[PDB]
Design a protein around this ligand. Sequence first.
Ligand SMILES: Nc1ncnc2c1ncn2[C@@H]1O[C@H](COP(=O)(O)OP(=O)(O)OP(O)(O)=S)[C@@H](O)[C@H]1O
Ligand SMILES: Nc1ncnc2c1ncn2[C@@H]1O[C@H](COP(=O)(O)OP(=O)(O)O)[C@@H](O)[C@H]1O
Ligand SMILES: Nc1ncnc2c1ncn2[C@@H]1O[C@H](COP(=O)(O)OP(=O)(O)O)[C@@H](O)[C@H]1O
Ligand SMILES: Nc1ncnc2c1ncn2[C@@H]1O[C@H](COP(=O)(O)OP(=O)(O)O)[C@@H](O)[C@H]1O
Ligand SMILES: [Mg+2]
Ligand SMILES: [Mg+2]
Ligand SMILES: [Mg+2]
Ligand SMILES: [Mg+2]
Lengths: 40, 426, 436, 426, 443
Amino acid sequence: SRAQTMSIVNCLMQLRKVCNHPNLFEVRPILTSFVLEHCV
Amino acid sequence: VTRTAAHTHIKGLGLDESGVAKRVEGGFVGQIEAREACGVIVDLIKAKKMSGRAILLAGGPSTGKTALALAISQELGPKVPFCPLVGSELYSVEVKKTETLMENFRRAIGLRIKETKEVYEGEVTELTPEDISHVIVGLKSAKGTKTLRLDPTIYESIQREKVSIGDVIYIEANTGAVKRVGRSDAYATEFDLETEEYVPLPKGEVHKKKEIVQDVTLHDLDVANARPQGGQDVISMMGQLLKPKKTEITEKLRQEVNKVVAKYIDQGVAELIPGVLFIDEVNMLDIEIFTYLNKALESNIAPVVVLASNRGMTTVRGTEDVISPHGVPPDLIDRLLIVRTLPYDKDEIRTIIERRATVERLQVESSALDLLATMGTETSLRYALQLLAPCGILAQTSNRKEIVVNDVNEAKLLFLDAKRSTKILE
Amino acid sequence: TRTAAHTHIKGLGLDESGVAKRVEGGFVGQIEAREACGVIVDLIKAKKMSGRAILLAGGPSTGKTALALAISQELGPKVPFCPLVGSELYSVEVKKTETLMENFRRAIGLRIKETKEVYEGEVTELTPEDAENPLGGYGKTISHVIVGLKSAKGTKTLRLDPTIYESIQREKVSIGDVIYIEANTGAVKRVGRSDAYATEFDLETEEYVPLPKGEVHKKKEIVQDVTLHDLDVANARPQGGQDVISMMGQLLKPKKTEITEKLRQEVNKVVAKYIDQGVAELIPGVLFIDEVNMLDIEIFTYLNKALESNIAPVVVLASNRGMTTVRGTEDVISPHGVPPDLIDRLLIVRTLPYDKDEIRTIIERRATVERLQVESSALDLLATMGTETSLRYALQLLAPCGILAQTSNRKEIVVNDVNEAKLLFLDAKRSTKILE
Amino acid sequence: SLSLIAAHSHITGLGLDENLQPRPTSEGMVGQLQARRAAGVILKMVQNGTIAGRAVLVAGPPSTGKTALAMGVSQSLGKDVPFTAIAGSEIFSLELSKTEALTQAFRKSIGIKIKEETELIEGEVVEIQIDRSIHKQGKLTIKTTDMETIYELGNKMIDGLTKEKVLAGDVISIDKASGKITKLGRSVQCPEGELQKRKTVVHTVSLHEIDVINSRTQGFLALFTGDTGEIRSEVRDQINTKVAEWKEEGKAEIVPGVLFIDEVHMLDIECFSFINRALEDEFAPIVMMATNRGVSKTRGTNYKSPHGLPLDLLDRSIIITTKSYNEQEIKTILSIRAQEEEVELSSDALDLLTKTGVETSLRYSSNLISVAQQIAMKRKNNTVEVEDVKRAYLLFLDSARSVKYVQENESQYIDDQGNVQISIAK
Amino acid sequence: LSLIAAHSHITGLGLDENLQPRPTSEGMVGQLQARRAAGVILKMVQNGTIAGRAVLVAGPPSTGKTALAMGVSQSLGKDVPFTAIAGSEIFSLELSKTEALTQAFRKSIGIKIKEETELIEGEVVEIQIDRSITGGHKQGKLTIKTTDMETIYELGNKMIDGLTKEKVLAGDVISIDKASGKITKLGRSFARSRDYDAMGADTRFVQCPEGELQKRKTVVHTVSLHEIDVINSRTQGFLALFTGDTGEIRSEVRDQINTKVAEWKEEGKAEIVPGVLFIDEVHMLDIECFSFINRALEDEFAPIVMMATNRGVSKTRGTNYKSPHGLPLDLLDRSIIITTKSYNEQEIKTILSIRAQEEEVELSSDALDLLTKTGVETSLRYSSNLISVAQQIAMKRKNNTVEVEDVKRAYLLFLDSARSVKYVQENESQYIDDQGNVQISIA
DNA sequence: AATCCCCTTGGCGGTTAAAACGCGG
Ligand SMILES: Nc1ncnc2c1ncn2[C@@H]1O[C@H](COP(=O)(O)OP(=O)(O)OP(O)(O)=S)[C@@H](O)[C@H]1O
Ligand SMILES: Nc1ncnc2c1ncn2[C@@H]1O[C@H](COP(=O)(O)OP(=O)(O)O)[C@@H](O)[C@H]1O
Ligand SMILES: Nc1ncnc2c1ncn2[C@@H]1O[C@H](COP(=O)(O)OP(=O)(O)O)[C@@H](O)[C@H]1O
Ligand SMILES: Nc1ncnc2c1ncn2[C@@H]1O[C@H](COP(=O)(O)OP(=O)(O)O)[C@@H](O)[C@H]1O
Ligand SMILES: [Mg+2]
Ligand SMILES: [Mg+2]
Ligand SMILES: [Mg+2]
Ligand SMILES: [Mg+2]
């Protein structure tokens, strides 16, 4: 959808990266607790 | 594939841009005025300006109050915090009813914050204690190596994780959490049989930094500042196994937490998302809960509490001579705006039954559906709604897909209504 | 200074022969009640009888609490006096009976004296010595340690046990630090650094303290007044121990527990032994329970047993209601809301209502103690108002009258100020009328 | 202190002149001339501090300004003076006796100011030189706007700086006595003068805070966790006698405050019996009690009472009575509320709101402003006109209309006997 | 571990392929309408699509409502959770009524996570562990054989420690889990070379395993939703799974668990198997419990609740008004009621015969007829209880069959409710009355 | 006014030419 309208070849490479694996863009997060700077 | 519940067909209020409600949209049929009022309330919540506003969804049984509340939640979206509740849930045994009500108040107020996470990961190449002493660890990765100095708590975490040279770890600097993810691939063939589960050597640099946005509630901050909550150290274990039960959080902690949140918002690192607290069957509350709810609504940081009741001219629980419009004492009623919910005629009952059948993947013949609608009119709408599944089961047992009149009659003869059972008792 | 409701009450105001003056000690009238309270005060000072009980019976605003506080003032601050109200017995941690018993033993004071010898000063030397022969001891084979302490009057060289040396090492004491050794227990405390070495470093975190006065070796006699309940609490929840379990227990909340009769018996045994040896002396105090009406029948029944004990203070009770059904009972109408069996163990001291002259004198004294000037006409108006509605209404209306007079920059309260105060602040009867 | 809009945000004071005469409309308060005059008398008594153990009852019909009066008193009293506001339903706890809860509330409203004189050096660090044993030799240099000198460290200061790991070029603060180090960013800000300054820090605490601090080994956490427990009376006596001694010495001053119980008609007879005696003793704050019921049965008793309170307590209190508003005062209160809520009402809209509030309730008309604003925004209109308020009236019901609807359709609601006719037919 | 109990004689609902109740099958007799309705509810549970339905079983005492519930549970079988609770169980001291009901509701939803594990199985040939005295280095190799293959594995430290702990020898057939690391001793292959101690304790030989030495197997972990909630509530919640003292789990934990389990289902990691919650004598529950049940049935993760009641019109607990079934109209509106009827003489006779078969009591025809007449006259449960006592009386007589005289003796020795009431009314002075008066003396 | 050379860009893989380098003496 973004490539339908930028350059086209970089979008084709990104599409190939999609076809390879989604982790090439962003890995699923390692969830961890929020840390407060200092207690009351 | 999918499961069906009481309000699975309710996808929203079905209100257009101008605010007028279509007759049948979002799974709703009729109830136009209540849908419009709830849309106005949703707009008020989205404004994020007022605090402590309260409304009452007043109507008879099987009229569409809980459905309206769930529709408000759907319209607002998953970003905002919507806390469902029942009047019977506030009668705790660990802490008093007031504390539970306040905790639910602060659970319905949302906060979205930005935090930078410092993360280290790599294959261990050295474990040298500095001498309870600091440990000097050397982490190697595919792009570089790094040597770090860790506090004694992290040393205790590493010690209890059985981390040796050649192990791959994951130290989160902000929280001090150490996870042994496995043994390095370079040592996979060292032995032909051992319990070790091997992992590849991490890619990228050892020191990684990412910015994540996480949604928390004020109750989460209160619990964090009140009692210890996590950790891999024995000190944390003893701290949390000591004083395990809930405690009556004081106003001072809430005020300090509010100051902290104000500082966070002022710095721009956080944004506030006030939400909704839904208390269904409000008539179960005692007079003390209502009395404290009067004071709690006057707080400058409070959610838009929505209340639902199906009682009229009923006496208030706890009191012995106070007759109230809906079981709610007049002091709280003056703080509320009442949205009246109206019964359903035959045509709307028929359409509701049709849509419920469509949702549960059932096929109902027009004559059978008319009989089901007329028996729902005669006895109850919910009774007609629950008869659909037995009818479908009976039809399937006869190798027939669509529901017929005979299956409905058989289901009626098998399962009875309240009036019929009472008549049998007589 | 702050002016409470009973600040003007300084004493019972009696003569040497026991007769009560008409106006003395802040009291106005109440001659018979004051004389009875004086006899009771003499009985308390006698320190011979246990479990004696009196009940102050009278109407609201008559002076029951005033008489109780006068008794407390007359006895002095060296004799226990534990105030209470009937509602405070209903705890949520332990049974009401245990709370009543704890209050009973909180009013039997004990004066225990102990002679203590302390070595204090600034450390000048620390020369540990080993045994003359290596075979003499085990391992380190550490013999005595020699420490030199300096005081304002000179120096002394002490010879200490190796245990004291271990304590010195634990407290991290170096040369020049002011220390404190108790020969009674062998405990070493680090007071701080001497002011002599204050300017050794221009930036250092050390609590610099002056050199101790007097000799290095000072023997002092320490006297403390402790209740028996203090000993019971000390035994029930001792503070000793440095284990992990000990510290974890220290962090836990101190919930009240039903201290067994065995612990009380053992405490009484040790206290009796010390009283026989002359180390300690017994001071029976007074227990005051205001609003006795709020006690349950179970509390009264347990009081029957408590008052028969060998160690029991003089319980003084106040009740402001008559012919009232006892709480916790359906049918037992009782004289003062107090069960008949407890009444049979009591001596009732009746207190009588006031007339206009007494109310006027009370308002005068209250205005004087409040640092307020009141005109005679406004004072007569206040007296008429008080005899019309209540004494406490006037006594509490005095202060807003003073504030109103100050807002007009007037040194004294005028009748107009009292009238404006009446208009601004209502009373119970007028509030009932306006709400009807 | 960032927070949303409450129902008492506009009341910024009691609106009195020098002679304690309240103005018609000032500091957000309208009308209630005698009530505000009496409240000013109470405020002057609180500020004087020479009067202890006074109870004032704020009685009157609902929606008259009792809580507004208390809020105005609190704001005019300002900070640096305790003001504890607890609802009468907060006393009933499963961990604290009602007498203990009332005692803790009483102690919370008496403040103690303790001055601590600390010697702290503040400046911009330049160089730090630490060497091994030759126990430790160290020199630090602190630069300010007009001095630059080196300091010869000792053992403990070196250990503390190593523990903090202070860098160079960052503003640092070191305390000579305590030894605490407070870090600050690089010099927006800059050192302003001499290296070592003499500034006193004042700590404001309450008697309850001291009691809880001395209650356990680490009792000051209970001020936030709320697990204080029933403190021993000997501890409180110790605190009281030490406060008397400190005041005599002049090293600490007492700031008496105000305790506000919003819903005293919920406390039982034991609580009132306790209050009667707790008022008499010294260190007793000024107790403000708000009640509305004319004559009711005191909780825990089977007899009526002139305000729901026993006659013994009413004898000890002075009563401030509030009177119902009229049309003009309703109009100006609604104007103030609309200005606070950032809503631009028209003249005819304000008149309609005023007539609705006079006919039904002030709170109902106050709540309709925001709903009317949201209705107008759906029409893309800035000012709220009459038709928006009329639509808000139609969509949201008040107490009287809801009662009328319930009475005219009593069959479709659940009654006190538990009967309802869910079936729309028959 | 079980004994002959009241409902031990029923193994299911006894239905055909078209849900038509058989006259007598799987232990149940009669109740054709009730059994057909129970079968419909059974199919509804087995479908797994309909959520949060409520069903009520009403009827006179001894009409088989608890028997119907046990039949439904038996037809469900294992792998489908069934939580049988009483109305008295909710009222706890450490948890609230709403919390106890929440835990009971979540106990009926099961989560299954299937995992594939690699297992090494074979008969040991040689084990050799070399360890240095006063040294931490250990080196070992083993030879594990199968009928078609044999191989040698050189072992890491943890495997050496595990095998040393398990006391593995040559004549041992053992299994090794490469992931968990546990060693299970399945049996022995031959004797231990005739040493003195343990001479003949290994006679029970086991056959050598056959096939690939390292084979993959699947393991299914079934855990209820409540167990997951308790595990994730606190760090010590795992102990709370056995000890109790779970506390009141915060709502955020339950919401997060719901979201995570929904994600697991959408990912195929976990399979959700909803079950049935059964409340005995629901009339003991408070009105607050009924309100919470009303709301909690609308959740998507809710089971199917079935309740038993026989009170007719009665006062709902917590309120002062009578209700049609001891339940408020709000709960009756959202529940389908299945009814039970009194039993004929023939149905009673065949139930008695079924019970006699289950209790292994051989009744003569005349004895069975007398028992049936007694049961019709007095109670079904009375005759059911009399069967075993009659068997014991017959054994005392040294007879292998129960005759009419044994039943007569059992009837004489043990009384029914009516006879006891009559004897009390005739001799009222010998019993303590409601006013607390009784005559102890006989003169 | 319709058509050629280079552009135009991610991630790849070669592949020399300085950077920065112990050490030998
Ligand atoms: N107007 C409507 N359109 C579509 N579905 C509706 C409508 N009103 C009710 N329902 C559905 O019918 C059922 C009625 O239940 P509710 O909406 O909760 O009624 P209720 O007012 O909550 O009754 P109570 O007070 O909970 S007993 C639910 O499954 C609703 O989703
Ligand atoms: N004899 C007296 N002389 C002076 N003041 C008195 C006397 N008796 C009572 N008072 C005053 O009247 C007030 C009511 O006294 P108190 O004993 O508290 O009431 P009650 O007797 O109802 O308990 C007190 O403030 C006290 O100062
Ligand atoms: N004198 C006043 N001046 C300004 N606003 C008032 C006044 N009295 C009442 N209000 C407004 O009316 C609303 C309700 O008053 P409230 O404090 O609830 O009185 P009560 O507690 O007696 O019902 C408050 O939001 C307040 O802003
Ligand atoms: N339809 C039936 N088929 C077989 N046995 C039955 C049937 N109904 C009742 N019973 C037997 O009779 C007894 C009745 O017990 P129960 O079902 O608890 O009675 P209730 O229905 O009053 O709860 C049970 O022991 C059961 O084995
Ligand atoms: Mg509902
Ligand atoms: Mg008194
Ligand atoms: Mg109010
Ligand atoms: Mg049963």
